[model samples]
Target: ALLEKVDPNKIYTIDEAAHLVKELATAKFDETVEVHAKLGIDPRRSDQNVRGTVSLPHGGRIEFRNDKTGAIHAPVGKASFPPEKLADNIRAFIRALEAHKPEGAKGTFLRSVYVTTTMGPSVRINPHS
Candidate 1:
């Protein structure tokens, strides 16, 4: 049940998104926020996780980044919260994300970047520098 008026196949954007979701919010629940990304390789090694460093304002939800079309996700704070601070957290996780470099993984480890509140719309950031 989303009152969100997002476009079909639309692509959202960056640090601004951190602030955007705040306005995009349709005033519902104080639902939390999380970051998720897609695209990666198969994992068949001694613990095939490239990025594994607990960093930032806390909350570690578990999951997988598996075979073929792989994906990985991490929990950031709520958009029922701040802007610059939140953006920083996003960057923090992002910085951490790249440093790992997915052991033996290949081809554009990160295809796209996305983040949203528990009940907010997604802000798909650029796959740029």
Candidate 2:
């Protein structure tokens, strides 16, 4: 069903992916898109690891990982969630970090935030006020 809405060979950015999934969803209710990932860092150490988990607005949680490669991976909810909902979550997550800015951490905490789904690329997000 989704094949019709997207080009299989074309590489899509995060913005396109997030929009495409919202447009292509075919479920009765909003389907939950499981955002998952595997980082190239060790999961054993807390101080040296490059990963963290954040809880979503919908009682879900996502584990974010930082890799040597700068590419990002985000699993947005099913198409049922409007674009705003996804944006809100990203914003909230960022805000939570902002509220609790860690000691000794300098420079921009967030370079960028993007929204995407399991079946699509990614869409960059500029959180709205």
Candidate 3:
């Protein structure tokens, strides 16, 4: 029923969203490991710089630091669909925002990174590290 037009308390399709952030930048934890960090939709669309970043889908290893002075670190893991295994990951960013909308375009994927993370150690983030 929702082909577009999102903003209901801030976008949450994909089964009302349970977890995202490229599934912890590509997780492989065997259960009881969490990592969800996302804060998008602010490319001049107006306020809402949410925040996210869970961890320990398996065990440990996530040393992404950036003192926060004009930071920039675009590290998307799992190498963009190597063999079709994207069970999640915001469904590839909602298919790139529903691809080139034009016909009555009113779709706005507003995702504000909630938060969650257990620990880290089972470690298996090596899709091609």
Candidate 4:
């Protein structure tokens, strides 16, 4: 199927990525769709850290402090749900992430974002959107 030929460089819009991610979860067990943000911040800055809890819009849930890697990953939803609901989950998470942005952080709060299941193909999201 066309799924196998997914473009690695194509940064999908958030809406499309949710559907693509839903289509990629072929595992037998319920697979979680995760949103991983590649943040650009200074870990050394004592004030630059992400640690909080978000009550997801529908499905519901990041504690990311002392992260020298500059990337935070969290599960947004399970593949058992519709893409629309999953998209909302993603929106809620991103909103929460932005709201909790470190005071000392500079530039982009989220440099890049990716969506995927536990073992599905990684789909890059257009962070600009």
Work out the TM-score per prediction: 0.70, 0.47, 0.21, 0.87
Candidate 4 residue-wise lDDT, 1-129, digit = tens: 546746888888878887888678877899988888877787666677777778777765344333577678888878888888888878777777888777778787888888888884689887555
Once fitted onto the true fold, the runs of candidate 4 whose alpha carbons sit more than 4 angstroms away are 1-5, 62-66
Question: On residues 1-129, what C-alpha lDDT tens digit does candidate 3 reach at each position?
Answer: 221222334433332333232243334552232323322333333233222342322222333321232121222233223222322432333333223223332444322222122332212121111
The candidate that achieves the highest TM-score relative to the unseen native structure: 4
Worst 10 residues of 1 by lDDT: 59-68
Candidate 1 residue 20 C-alpha distance from true site, Å: 1.2
Alpha-carbon local distance difference test for all models: 0.63, 0.49, 0.29, 0.77
CA lDDT, candidate 3, residue 89: 39
Cα error, candidate 4, residue 13 (Å): 1.4
| Total backbone collisions for each predicted model | 1, 5, 14, 0
Q: On residues 1-129, what C-alpha lDDT tens digit does candidate 2 reach at each position?
A: 555666655544444555666775565666554332232233343443344566778546566655544223545455676665664555545454344333434455444554445444434444333
lDDT of 1 at 50: 53
Segments in model 1 whose C-alpha atoms lie over 4 Å from true places: 1-13, 43-48, 57-69, 127-129
23, model 3: CA deviation in Å?
23
TM-score of 1: 0.70
